[PDB]
Design a protein around this ligand. Sequence first.
Ligand SMILES: *Cc1c(COP(=O)(O)O)cnc(C)c1O
Ligand SMILES: *Cc1c(COP(=O)(O)O)cnc(C)c1O
Ligand code: NA
Ligand code: NA
Ligand code: NA
Ligand code: NA
Lengths: 382, 390
Amino acid sequence: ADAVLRARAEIDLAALRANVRALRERAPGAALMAVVKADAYGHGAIPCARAAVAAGATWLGTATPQEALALRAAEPGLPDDVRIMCWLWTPGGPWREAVEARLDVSVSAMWAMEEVTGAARAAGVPARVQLKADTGLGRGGCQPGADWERLVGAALRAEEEGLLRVTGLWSHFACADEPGHPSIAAQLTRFREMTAYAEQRGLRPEVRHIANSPATLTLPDAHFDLVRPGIAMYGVSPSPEIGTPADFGLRPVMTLAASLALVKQVPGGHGVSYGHHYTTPGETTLGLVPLGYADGIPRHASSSGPVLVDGKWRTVAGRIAMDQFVVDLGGDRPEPGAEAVLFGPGDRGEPTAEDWAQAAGTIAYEIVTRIGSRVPRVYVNE
Amino acid sequence: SETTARRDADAVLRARAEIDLAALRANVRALRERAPGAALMAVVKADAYGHGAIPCARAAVAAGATWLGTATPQEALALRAAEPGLPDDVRIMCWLWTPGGPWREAVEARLDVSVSAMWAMEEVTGAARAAGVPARVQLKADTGLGRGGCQPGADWERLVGAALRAEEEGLLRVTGLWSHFACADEPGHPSIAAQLTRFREMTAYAEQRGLRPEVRHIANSPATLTLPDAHFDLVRPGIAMYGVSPSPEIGTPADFGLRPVMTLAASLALVKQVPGGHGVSYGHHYTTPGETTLGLVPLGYADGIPRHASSSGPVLVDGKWRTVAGRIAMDQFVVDLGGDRPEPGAEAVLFGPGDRGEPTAEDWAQAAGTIAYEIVTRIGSRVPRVYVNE
Ligand SMILES: *Cc1c(COP(=O)(O)O)cnc(C)c1O
Ligand SMILES: *Cc1c(COP(=O)(O)O)cnc(C)c1O
Ligand code: NA
Ligand code: NA
Ligand code: NA
Ligand code: NA
C-alpha cells in the first residue's frame, strides 16, 4: 500500500487473457506459446504465465534457463503438462537441472548438443531438444549447409542412444514487422528447406515454429504448429506499420501511473531541470512526477514524453532526472498526490506505450520491458 | 549452502556486473580530499546507481562518508533495516515524498526528511505529533533548478514560518537547508553562480528568522569536483563515487583520481561462420560484407543494453574492440568478429574502468546518445552483481 503511493505499474491480467484468446482465434491451426522472458516483458513472469495458461496457452517461452526453472518451481504449480522452453544458453549452463525439470531446451550449435547429451546421460532422463535454424536473422540458430547437416546427424545419433528427442525445429524472423519485406519470404523458404531436410534424415519434431507477434498477426502461412506472439500478448502492437492494438482485438496490459509530488507556481524565465533545456515562457505552474530513468522513464523522452495530468495531456519539461521529471501545467493547480497517468490502454484519454516509444525514439517493447524494479507491480483480475 | 552457491555460480555464467568496492572506497577518499571543508554524503539512491545500495553504503561509510542519501523513504528505511546494521550514528536522508507516505515510520527511524512544500510540512508535523518524537527536517530551496524545492519569496517565507512554529511546539528541528544545481556539469554556466547567490540569500533569510541547521548543502558531483565555494557543510557526489565522470566537459575519471566501480561482462553464446550478404538482426540494418564470423553476446535491452546503441555499442572480445552489428534485441546482440574464432563462452567485456583495454560506461553513453549515469543505473536486475573487495 505504501510503495504504490509514489507510482505503480498496474497489470490487468483479464486484458492479458483477452489478448491470448484473440491471438488463439487469429492462429487457429497452432498452439500458442506465452513468451514470458524478461519478467514477462516487465509485467511479472509467474502471474502472466498463470493467466496465459488459463486462457489457453499450452507452451511457455523464456530466454534463460533460470527464467524457465523459476516457472517450474512456482507454487502453486503451473499445470505439469505445460511445456516450457528456454533458448539462451552458454557453455556450462544448468543443462542437467533443465533436463530433470523436463524443459524444452534450444540447441543451435554442436557445443550445446554435446553438453545437453552429456547432461541427459548423467541424469538418466532423455532431453527435449529444439533445434534452432538460422534462416536469415543472423542471431541465434544453426546455419544451413554443413553446420545443419552435422547438427541434425548428431541429434539422430543421440536419439538412437535414447538420450533425447528432438521435440521441435524453429527459427525467428528479422523483418516480420515490415509487411512484404523480401526477407520474410526468403526466411520462410529457408525454414521449409531446413525442416524438410531434418525430417528426411529422420527427425520427427512435435512442433515447427517461426512466428513472433507480427508474423502471427499478418502471416497465416507462418503459423505452422506453434505461434510465439510475445508483445501482442501484452496488448502492444509490434509496430504502427502492423497496426494498433484495436486492429487485432488487443488491449495493453500495463498502466504506468504516479502521484504528483509537488505543484508550484513559478515566474516566467525560470529554467527547468538539468541544462535548463526548458524555460517557462511566463508565470505558470509546474508539476513534479516522481518517476525517472532509474524507474525506466527513458531519458530520450526528455522534452517529449506524454502524461495525462488533471484532465489534459502534458509533456515532459526539459531533462528527465534519475528519479523524477517535471511537467508545465500552464497554470492548472491540481493537488499534490493527484494522478499522473504515463501510459495505459488509452480508453481513459491517457497515452499508450507506443506514444512513449515515439517520444523516446524506440519501440514499445523497450518501454514496457524496462520499467524498473523500483516501480511496484499491482496485479488486477488475477 | 552448496545448493545456493551453485545457483549463484550458475547465473553469472551468462553475464555479470562486477562491483569493485575497493574502487568505490578509493573514490570516496578522493572526493573527501577534494572537499576538505565538508562532510561527504554517499548518494545510494536507485540501488546505488545500479551497483547495490547496501554494499555500496557500507563501503562508503568505511571510507569516511558520514551521510547516506536516498530518493524514496523505502530506500532509506531499507538502509536502516540492513543487517548487520550500518552504524547507528550515520545520518540517512531521503527526499522523494508524496502525500500519504510513511512519514511516521521515517520519523521513528530518525531519518532526515526533505520538505519542499506546505503539504509535506503539515504531514510530517502530524506524524511527529502522533509518534511523540521530533522529526529531522531538511528544507529544500528551489534556487533555480525548477524541480523539487520551495520557491523563493512568499512560499519560502511561509515554509520557514511553519517550520519555526513546529520547532516552537517541539515537533521537529530543521536540521538542513539544501538545494541542487541545474548546470554544474557545464563549468562557468551563469546559472551556477545565480543558484549559489539565491541559495545564500534563502539560507540567510531562514537563519535570520531563527532556523539553525546542522548542514547547508548544494553540491552534486560536478560541483564537488569543480566548485569549492559550493561545498558548504556537506557534499553529495553521487556519480563520482561510482567512479564515473559527470561529463567529458568536467573531465575523465583519471583527472579526479576516480576509478569506475562497475564492470559489465558476458560470455559468448555462439560463434558461427556466415557468408557475405547475410543480414544481421531485426530490420537487417547490418549486412555482412563478405564471409565472416558472428559472435552472440547474451545481453539485450531487458538487461539494460540500450537499444539506442544499435550499430554502435563497443565491446571487447578476443583482444579487439567490436561494435554491435545492427539492432540490439531484448536478450542478445551480435558482433561481427571479422573471421576470428574465439571459443563459445569467451569473455565479452562491455565496459569497465578501461585499464584492460575495454570500453567505459562513457563510451556506451556516447554510443547510445545519453549520459553515463543512465548506462550504469539501468543495468537490469537480470544481470547478477558480483561484489569484490568487500
Ligand atoms: C522475444 C521472442 C519472441 C516473441 O517476439 P515478439 O516480437 O514479442 O512476438 C518469439 N521468439 C523468440 C525466439 C524470442 O526471442
Ligand atoms: C541524485 C542526486 C545527487 C547526486 O547527483 P550526482 O550528479 O550523481 O552527484 C545529489 N543530490 C540529490 C538531491 C540527488 O537527487
Ligand atoms: Na533466423
Ligand atoms: Na523534467
Ligand atoms: Na555520493
Ligand atoms: Na534548485
